[PDB]
Design an enzyme around this catalytic site. Structure first.
Site, PDB file in Angstrom:
ATOM      1  N   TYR A  87      52.805  46.587  64.747  1.00  0.00           N
ATOM      2  CA  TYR A  87      53.941  47.597  64.404  1.00  0.00           C
ATOM      3  C   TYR A  87      53.747  48.292  63.266  1.00  0.00           C
ATOM      4  O   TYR A  87      53.299  47.629  62.116  1.00  0.00           O
ATOM      5  CB  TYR A  87      55.067  46.827  64.647  1.00  0.00           C
ATOM      6  CG  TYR A  87      56.287  47.470  64.332  1.00  0.00           C
ATOM      7  CD1 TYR A  87      57.108  48.496  64.794  1.00  0.00           C
ATOM      8  CD2 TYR A  87      57.232  46.790  63.063  1.00  0.00           C
ATOM      9  CE1 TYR A  87      58.067  49.140  64.210  1.00  0.00           C
ATOM     10  CE2 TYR A  87      58.447  47.583  62.717  1.00  0.00           C
ATOM     11  CZ  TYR A  87      58.847  48.736  63.155  1.00  0.00           C
ATOM     12  OH  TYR A  87      59.858  49.281  62.764  1.00  0.00           O
ATOM     13  N   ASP A 131      40.132  62.210  68.639  1.00  0.00           N
ATOM     14  CA  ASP A 131      41.596  62.889  68.970  1.00  0.00           C
ATOM     15  C   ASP A 131      42.413  62.532  67.772  1.00  0.00           C
ATOM     16  O   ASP A 131      43.764  62.024  67.900  1.00  0.00           O
ATOM     17  CB  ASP A 131      42.255  62.075  69.967  1.00  0.00           C
ATOM     18  CG  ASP A 131      43.408  62.987  70.529  1.00  0.00           C
ATOM     19  OD1 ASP A 131      43.323  63.884  71.221  1.00  0.00           O
ATOM     20  OD2 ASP A 131      44.463  62.245  70.697  1.00  0.00           O
TER      21      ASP A 131
HETATM   22  C1  LIG Z   1      49.791  57.943  68.878  1.00  0.00           C
HETATM   23  C2  LIG Z   1      50.794  57.663  70.254  1.00  0.00           C
HETATM   24  C3  LIG Z   1      51.083  56.376  70.805  1.00  0.00           C
HETATM   25  N1  LIG Z   1      51.819  55.299  69.979  1.00  0.00           N
HETATM   26  C4  LIG Z   1      51.355  54.148  69.674  1.00  0.00           C
HETATM   27  O1  LIG Z   1      50.331  53.615  70.401  1.00  0.00           O
HETATM   28  C5  LIG Z   1      52.367  53.429  68.625  1.00  0.00           C
HETATM   29  C6  LIG Z   1      51.686  52.391  68.032  1.00  0.00           C
HETATM   30  C7  LIG Z   1      52.616  51.464  67.177  1.00  0.00           C
HETATM   31  N2  LIG Z   1      52.851  50.671  66.364  1.00  0.00           N
HETATM   32  N3  LIG Z   1      54.163  50.889  65.752  1.00  0.00           N
HETATM   33  C8  LIG Z   1      54.922  51.787  66.259  1.00  0.00           C
HETATM   34  N4  LIG Z   1      56.105  52.259  65.756  1.00  0.00           N
HETATM   35  C9  LIG Z   1      56.729  53.465  65.733  1.00  0.00           C
HETATM   36  O2  LIG Z   1      56.367  54.312  66.758  1.00  0.00           O
HETATM   37  C10 LIG Z   1      57.847  53.816  64.919  1.00  0.00           C
HETATM   38  C11 LIG Z   1      58.614  55.186  65.206  1.00  0.00           C
HETATM   39  C12 LIG Z   1      59.529  55.572  64.159  1.00  0.00           C
HETATM   40  C13 LIG Z   1      59.986  54.655  63.071  1.00  0.00           C
HETATM   41  N5  LIG Z   1      60.971  54.797  62.482  1.00  0.00           N
HETATM   42  C14 LIG Z   1      62.380  55.227  62.698  1.00  0.00           C
HETATM   43  C15 LIG Z   1      63.209  56.129  61.888  1.00  0.00           C
HETATM   44  N6  LIG Z   1      62.937  56.038  60.165  1.00  0.00           N
HETATM   45  C16 LIG Z   1      63.507  57.053  59.380  1.00  0.00           C
HETATM   46  C17 LIG Z   1      61.238  56.101  60.093  1.00  0.00           C
HETATM   47  C18 LIG Z   1      60.670  54.948  60.878  1.00  0.00           C
HETATM   48  C19 LIG Z   1      59.398  53.342  63.108  1.00  0.00           C
HETATM   49  C20 LIG Z   1      58.401  52.762  63.989  1.00  0.00           C
HETATM   50  C21 LIG Z   1      53.833  52.637  67.051  1.00  0.00           C
HETATM   51  S1  LIG Z   1      53.627  53.865  68.458  1.00  0.00           S
HETATM   52  C22 LIG Z   1      51.331  56.203  72.268  1.00  0.00           C
HETATM   53  C23 LIG Z   1      50.582  56.184  73.521  1.00  0.00           C
HETATM   54  C24 LIG Z   1      51.071  56.151  74.752  1.00  0.00           C
HETATM   55  C25 LIG Z   1      52.365  56.062  75.047  1.00  0.00           C
HETATM   56  C26 LIG Z   1      53.494  56.009  74.076  1.00  0.00           C
HETATM   57  C27 LIG Z   1      52.953  56.055  72.592  1.00  0.00           C
END
Ligand SMILES: CC[C@@H](NC(=O)c1cc2[nH]nc(NC(=O)c3ccc(N4CCN(C)CC4)cc3)c2s1)c1ccccc1
EC number: 2.7.11.1
Length: 253
Positions: A87, A131
């Site tokens: 995370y 990528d």
């Molecule tokens: C690289 C894209 C890939 N994603 C992952 O593998 C991902 C792996 C992974 N670990 N943690 C994540 N956490 C978040 O996405 C995240 C987003 C915004 C956040 N905030 C909210 C607003 N605040 C003001 C800032 C903090 C906190 C955590 C993700 S996404 C993916 C592939 C396929 C389907 C979906 C996603």
């Protein structure tokens, strides 16, 4: 080793993808917080990357580095695959950028570092990411870059992919010194160096290698980017060279 879709109390969605989505989740026994990525078996083949996943899962889990997102484990049910991911609390370099418009020298410099070192390693250990774009970088609580998604490591937007690849030709790991350059440019300027409105001209722009620096781009960086963005893979520095570049050090951390 082997968890079930029931060890997990599921929570806020973190990202909605084509194949799947990804959730905030907590393992009920340990109260551990992970990103639960939920891919769908159905489409993975209707796309054909069912195997470009066999790669991400195997490649991911076997890697240990502070700027590469850990895969912890995996299990698929009958409908879909699940990938117990690490995370990343601060979200994506992507939102971070839309948020701030441009990054500064130190920030950009630091990220290139974190990404360089993280990238070097992947190369120390033989593997190439390709990528690398802002959508695939994430930030730890420390606030440091972390690399996510591999399934493309050993269609979409051309913006970050070097001539070779795009032009079909067999490629290596210079790919990432090229991205590292586009990456760099994007941070400092906000758009990627080959921005266009269509897929068509963007191909042109990358192959003819056409870009121009905004007035506020410093020569220290100017120079850096220009030795990352050479059409010929041969004339692209090694990450150690990169981490050496002065602008890259009198500005990193
Ligand atoms: C690289 C894209 C890939 N994603 C992952 O593998 C991902 C792996 C992974 N670990 N943690 C994540 N956490 C978040 O996405 C995240 C987003 C915004 C956040 N905030 C909210 C607003 N605040 C003001 C800032 C903090 C906190 C955590 C993700 S996404 C993916 C592939 C396929 C389907 C979906 C996603």
């Amino acid at each position: 080793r082997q968890w079930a879709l029931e060890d997990f109390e599921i929570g806020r969605p973190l990202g909605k993808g084509k194949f799947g989505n990804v959730y905030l989740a907590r393992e009920k026994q340990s109260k551990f917080i992970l990103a639960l990525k939920v891919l769908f078996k159905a489409q993975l083949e209707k796309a054909g990357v069912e195997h470009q996943l066999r790669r991400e899962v195997e490649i991911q889990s076997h890697l240990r580095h502070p700027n590469i997102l850990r895969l912890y484990g995996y299990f698929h049910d009958a409908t879909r695959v699940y990938l117990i991911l690490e995370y990343a609390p601060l979200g994506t370099v992507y939102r971070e950028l839309q948020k701030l418009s441009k990054f500064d020298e130190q920030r950009t410099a630091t990220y290139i570092t974190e990404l360089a070192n993280a990238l070097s390693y992947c190369h120390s250990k033989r593997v190439i990411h390709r990528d690398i774009k802002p959508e695939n970088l994430l930030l730890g609580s420390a606030g440091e870059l972390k690399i996510a998604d591999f399934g493309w490591s050993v269609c979409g937007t051309l913006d970050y992919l070097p001539p070779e690849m795009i032009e079909g030709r067999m490629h290596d790991e210079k790919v990432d010194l090229w991205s590292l350059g586009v990456l760099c440019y994007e941070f400092l300027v906000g758009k990627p160096p080959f921005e266009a409105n269509t897929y068509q001209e963007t191909y042109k722009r990358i192959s003819r290698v056409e870009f121009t620096f905004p007035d506020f781009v410093t020569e220290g960086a100017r120079d850096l980017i220009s030795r990352l963005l050479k059409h010929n893979p041969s004339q692209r520095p090694m990450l150690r060279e990169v981490l050496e570049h002065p602008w890259i050090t009198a500005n990193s951390s």
